[PDB]
């Protein structure tokens, strides 16, 4: 994304949560306006903040919008449930010549504790490599805020082709889980020293790897 | 009160064309200043601006999607008109209209938006799943527990069940929600988290019923050996 923001920012009802949308020479910094949308799970888009600050009727005042240099934020105090939903900024690009939006982020109103996620990796079964096919298996539960990005590694090369990952979903416990995919030939899991499944959950960044050589 | 419908097939096949219909209320579009956009959200993914038009017939483009895109507006029926052409299943996506404040003594944001509609582009053809293990290793951990598993690859529509031993075994077992992948197939992992000690000595099989394509398999588990 042009525009970069947080994957997930949470707090406890009460406190007071910002989320940073960092941007460059090209639109930000070029002195394009800067908005925001909400966004709850299920619905459309709602116009938060237009021109960096300004709130439509009916966004209350402990919503607020600024902007510096090549970034802008938004600041929530006082957080109330009805605050948790996905969050966007937008702005324009005049290199790409269009409109651009942040990658989003999930404000969580905590409910419950935090919780790490638990990460299992499988490879590639001796099965699905004897159909000539090769997938590998990411398996996220148990975490809370319900928000994870996940990246894979051949080695210590990043892959960004082959891949499929959920939506975090909630779970019985009312933590999350999620699921991430990376499908190969078999002579490329069979060629590389290792291959990873790279969590992270605000902030924090756990790899598991597996290897053809492991029996 | 200026209101916005989205209206167009739920489904769409690859290559076809997808024609997509916004209908505008309370707002002319012939007035001045009165812009709207098509702007797309493909499943747990950030929104995507991809066209404007205005008043004058003008109309922009996202330069990644230009060549695919057409914009158009249907005064007589007030209504602004999306075409995309070559669909793929990596397109599927929620598809929103939004009035765009369009004039500089205003701003250039998305003031009023639609609902949104999902496009999925698809087959016309269901599909069984393939399963394959995914063996358990007997190595020690912490917790004296290890997680073996079923995966289940490339199958539509949803939905799909997986139990274990016919059903008795329930304790442990973590079904995941379905990825929807780029070929417009699903797939999903059912995990059962079991006690290390048993690898050697308690048979593990995964039942899996694919109602709509009439699919059943049964899988052993067998545990990693060397």
């Known amino acids: 994304s042009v525009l970069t923001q947080p994957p997930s920012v949470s707090g406890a009802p009460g406190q007071r949560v910002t989320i940073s949308c960092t941007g460059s020479?090209?639109?930000?910094?070029?002195?394009?306006?800067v908005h925001w949308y909400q966004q709850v799970p299920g619905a459309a888009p709602k116009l938060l903040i237009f021109v960096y600050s300004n709130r439509p009727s009916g966004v209350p005042d402990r919503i607020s919008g600024s902007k510096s240099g090549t970034s802008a934020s938004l600041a929530i105090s006082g957080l109330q449930a009805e605050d948790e939903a996905d969050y966007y900024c937008?702005?324009?690009?005049?290199?790409?010549?269009?409109?651009?939006f942040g990658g989003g982020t999930k404000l969580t109103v905590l409910g419950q504790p935090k919780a790490a996620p638990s990460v299992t990796l499988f490879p590639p079964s001796s099965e699905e490599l004897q159909a000539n096919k090769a997938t590998l298996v990411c398996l996220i539960s148990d975490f809370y805020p319900g928000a994870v990005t996940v990246a894979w590694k051949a080695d210590s090369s990043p892959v960004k082709a082959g891949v499929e990952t959920t939506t975090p979903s909630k779970q019985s416990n009312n933590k999350y889980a999620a699921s991430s995919y990376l499908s190969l030939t078999p002579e490329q899991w069979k060629s590389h020293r290792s291959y990873s499944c790279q969590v992270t959950h605000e902030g924090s960044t756990v790899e598991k790897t597996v290897a053809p050589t492991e029996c | 009160q200026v209101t916005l419908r989205e209206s167009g097939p739920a489904l769409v096949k690859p290559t076809q064309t997808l024609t997509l219909t916004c209908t505008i209320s309370?707002?002319?579009?012939?007035?001045?200043?009165?812009?709207v956009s098509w702007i797309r959200q493909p499943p747990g993914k950030a929104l995507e601006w991809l066209a404007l038009?205005?008043?004058?017939?003008?109309?922009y483009y996202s330069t990644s999607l230009r060549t695919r895109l057409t914009i158009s507006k249907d005064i007589s029926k007030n209504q602004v008109v999306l075409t995309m052409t070559n669909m793929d299943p990596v397109d599927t996506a929620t598809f929103f209209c939004?009035?765009?404040?369009?004039?500089?003594?205003?701003?250039?944001?998305?003031?009023?938006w639609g609902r949104g509609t999902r496009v999925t582009v698809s087959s016309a053809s269901t599909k069984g799943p393939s399963v394959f293990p995914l063996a358990p290793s007997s190595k020690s951990t912490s917790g004296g527990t290890a997680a073996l598993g079923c995966l289940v690859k490339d199958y539509f529509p949803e939905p799909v069940t997986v139990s274990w031993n016919s059903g008795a075994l329930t304790s442990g077992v973590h079904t995941f929600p379905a990825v929807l992948q780029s070929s417009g197939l699903y797939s999903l992992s059912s995990v059962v988290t079991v006690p290390s000690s048993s690898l050697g000595t308690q048979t593990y099989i995964c039942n899996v019923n694919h109602k709509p394509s009439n699919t059943k398999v049964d899988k052993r588990v067998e545990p990693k050996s060397c």
């Open positions: 937008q702005s324009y690009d005049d290199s790409l010549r269009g409109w651009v």
């Open positions: 038009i205005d008043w004058d017939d003008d109309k």
């Open positions: 939004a009035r765009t404040r369009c004039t500089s003594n205003w701003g250039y944001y998305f003031d009023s």
């Open positions: 309370g707002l002319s579009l012939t007035t001045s200043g009165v812009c």
């Open positions: 020479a090209s639109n930000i910094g070029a002195g394009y306006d």
